[PDB]
Amino acid sequence: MDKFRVYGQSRLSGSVNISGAKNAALPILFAAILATEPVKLTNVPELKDIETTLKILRQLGVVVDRDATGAVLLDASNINHFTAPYELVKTMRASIWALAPLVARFHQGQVSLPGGCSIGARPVDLHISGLEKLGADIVLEEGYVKAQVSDRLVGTRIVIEKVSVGATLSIMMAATLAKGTTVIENAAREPEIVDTADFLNKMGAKITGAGSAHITIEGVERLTGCEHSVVPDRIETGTFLIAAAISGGCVVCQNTKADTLDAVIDKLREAGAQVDVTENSITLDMLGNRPKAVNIRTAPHPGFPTDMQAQFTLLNMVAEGTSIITETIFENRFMHIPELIRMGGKAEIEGNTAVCHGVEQLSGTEVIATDLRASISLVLAGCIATGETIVDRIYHIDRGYEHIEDKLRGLGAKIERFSG
Numbered sequence: 001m002d003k004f005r006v007y008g009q010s011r012l013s014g015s016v017n018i019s020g021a022k023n024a025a026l027p028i029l030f031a032a033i034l035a036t037e038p039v040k041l042t043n044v045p046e047l048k049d050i051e052t053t054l055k056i057l058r059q060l061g062v063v064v065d066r067d068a069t070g071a072v073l074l075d076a077s078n079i080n081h082f083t084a085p086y087e088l089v090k091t092m093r094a095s096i097w098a099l100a101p102l103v104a105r106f107h108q109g110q111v112s113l114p115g116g117c118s119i120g121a122r123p124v125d126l127h128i129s130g131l132e133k134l135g136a137d138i139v140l141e142e143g144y145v146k147a148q149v150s151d152r153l154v155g156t157r158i159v160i161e162k163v164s165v166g167a168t169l170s171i172m173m174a175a176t177l178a179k180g181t182t183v184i185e186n187a188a189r190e191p192e193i194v195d196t197a198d199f200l201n202k203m204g205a206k207i208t209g210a211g212s213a214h215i216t217i218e219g220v221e222r223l224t225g226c227e228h229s230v231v232p233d234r235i236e237t238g239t240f241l242i243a244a245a246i247s248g249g250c251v252v253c254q255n256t257k258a259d260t261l262d263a264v265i266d267k268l269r270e271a272g273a274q275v276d277v278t279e280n281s282i283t284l285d286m287l288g289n290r291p292k293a294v295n296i297r298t299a300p301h302p303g304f305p306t307d308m309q310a311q312f313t314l315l316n317m318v319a320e321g322t323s324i325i326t327e328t329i330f331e332n333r334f335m336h337i338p339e340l341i342r343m344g345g346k347a348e349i350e351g352n353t354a355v356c357h358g359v360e361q362l363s364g365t366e367v368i369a370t371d372l373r374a375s376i377s378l379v380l381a382g383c384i385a386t387g388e389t390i391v392d393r394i395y396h397i398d399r400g401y402e403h404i405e406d407k408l409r410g411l412g413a414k415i416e417r418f419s420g
């Protein structure tokens with residue numbers, strides 16, 4: 001069981017390279033099940049989720065590997081198995097995305113129904129419902145969601161009653177091969193959705209409206225292939241900007257996308273940070289100042305993203321003043337707070353809200369990670385706390401961040417990966 005040993009009390013400053021969005025790469029990799037010709041993906045981060053996805057793809061008959069340039073070369077021309085097995089799906093519920101394309105292209109597909117997840121209730125009822133609207137027959141047999149359709153799917157109007165990134169993507173993927181036109185009202189607008197749609201369009205799809213709540217897809221018989229560079233990861237960018245914001249440092253993020261972080265950038269500024277945005281970089285200079293507490297309310301894009309909530313909870317815990325953090329996406333995504341309280345943080349939780357009271361300095365001790373995106377807050381806390389900090393179960397961190405120790409050490413942190 002790997003752990004991080006972190007020695008704090010150091011301002012984080014310098015340059016860090018942002019990688020492609022983990023959550024654009026994942027849906028793009030599953031959407032790739034639709035490609036009848038070779039696919040080349042660049043800027044795909046090196047992290048566990050990608051590896052898990054590749055394992056799922058390979059057992060469907062997809063040949064895919066990252067070559068020495070770092071590019072991911074994929075050939076889905078001969079899929080001969082149509083089941084994403086329980087043993088793989090249980091490790092990453094996003095694999096639910098394998099069902100839509102399998103069903104749309106091969107008219108059948110089977111995926112283990114995701115079970116429980118720590119951060120909250122996460123059913124996939126909207127995905128199923130949406131696929132059923134396109135004409136799929138779906139049953140749940142022995143823990144497996146089984147889909148089938150006698151003929152090509154049929155495009156129709158679909159209003160997803162809840163804003164859902166995942167359901168918006170399952171439906172959009174399936175619609176690219178449906179007959180006629182599909183319309184997805186109340187679609188999630190996340191930048192990763194825009195990227196998947198762009199990726200699909202490069203293969204012959206016909207999607208317009210991605211990024212808005214109204215997506216239109218004109219179905220085609222089949223998709224070909226393409227080369228595609230994944231959109232920068234806004235969450236990784238946010239995380240490093242916060243690294244500077246919580247340590248009074250100055251950080252430059254390279255290869256960023258200007259407009260995917262407005263909510264986050266506005267809050268950093270509200271917190272007292274000076275942030276400079278160019279077309280391909282974002283620089284945050286905290287000018288050696290302590291942050292000013294800010295309220296936070298998570299919500300679907302373009303609002304403040306839940307994947308940046310813990311990072312900002314940390315900022316508030318060392319800020320000056322009181323703050324209210326409300327999480328509306330996942331009702332139980334506050335696991336970091338008590339771990340951060342072990343370090344000296346002050347916060348009270350009540351339902352989906354946390355009231356934090358900022359302190360001057362945290363102090364190191366041992367804490368446990370449990371959220372692949374949120375737990376990064378614990379590592380950052382180690383960087384600015386007094387003495388030593390030990391973050392256990394960092395394997396969670398490895399699913400959502402690539403070379404995190406290298407990038408952090410690159411900003412001046414003293415972090416070593418060890419075991420036992």
Ligand SMILES: CC(=O)N[C@H]1[C@@H](OP(=O)(O)OP(=O)(O)OC[C@H]2O[C@@H](n3ccc(=O)[nH]c3=O)[C@H](O)[C@@H]2O)O[C@H](CO)[C@@H](O)[C@@H]1O[C@H](C)C(=O)O
Nearest residue numbers: 023094121122123124125126127164165166167307329373
């Ligand atoms: C792989 C990936 O892209 N995962 C991301 C995506 O999860 P997702 O599940 O698809 O997004 P949702 O559908 O927008 O849903 C958010 C809310 O919607 C409810 N809902 C969703 C689908 C459904 O059928 N029924 C239904 O009720 C749901 O229960 C929740 O309350 O969006 C989240 C919010 O931005 C991210 O935190 C999450 O990152 C994670 C950490 C990670 O990288 O591992």
